Amino acid sequence: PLIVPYNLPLPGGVVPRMLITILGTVKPNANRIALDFQRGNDVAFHFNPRFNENNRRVIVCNTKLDNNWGREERQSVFPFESGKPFKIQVLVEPDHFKVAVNDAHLLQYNHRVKKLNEISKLGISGDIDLTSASYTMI
Ligand SMILES: COC(=O)[C@@H]1O[C@H](CO)[C@H](O)[C@H](O)[C@@H]1S[C@@H]1O[C@H](CO)[C@H](O)[C@H](O)[C@H]1O
Ligand SMILES: [Cl-]
Ligand SMILES: [Cl-]
Known part of the structure; x- marks a missing residue:
């Protein structure tokens, strides 16, 4: 797996249509x-x-x-x-981060930081065994 805390670089920050997927247990x-x-x-x-x-x-x-x-x-x-495998998907949309866990919509968080292209790292931490962390443009 991966070592927590883990740093995933986000080259050129985030942008609408960028999907970050975190898998772990x-x-x-x-x-x-x-x-x-x-x-x-x-x-x-x-x-x-x-x-x-x-x-x-x-x-x-x-x-x-x-x-x-x-x-x-x-x-x-x-x-x-506790003890169970999860998948977190964070999809950046124009006005908010949209988060789904295990393929079910969970929450939206409106952008407060406006310079999306300078949000250049994701830190992943806490009580998990981290399997993978990646991004794709959809
Ligand atoms: C450090 O204290 C706080 O900012 C707040 O403290 C109260 C208790 O008085 C309560 O725990 C709040 O949740 C936060 S704790 C703080 O919250 C931020 C996000 O708002 C981060 O999770 C941070 O790691 C926490 O320490
Ligand atoms: Cl609440
Ligand atoms: Cl800003």
């Missing part, structure tokens, strides 16, 4: 997973499944600018399960 007794689509030190799109926040499972998404986190967007639909 959640560790037993997981606490968190995180995708960090980075513009330099800023995080344009942070996707953070939390497996135990006050005994609830929640996906937290946010942007970090100049080292400050913004206002979080939260989703109680939670398709992940």
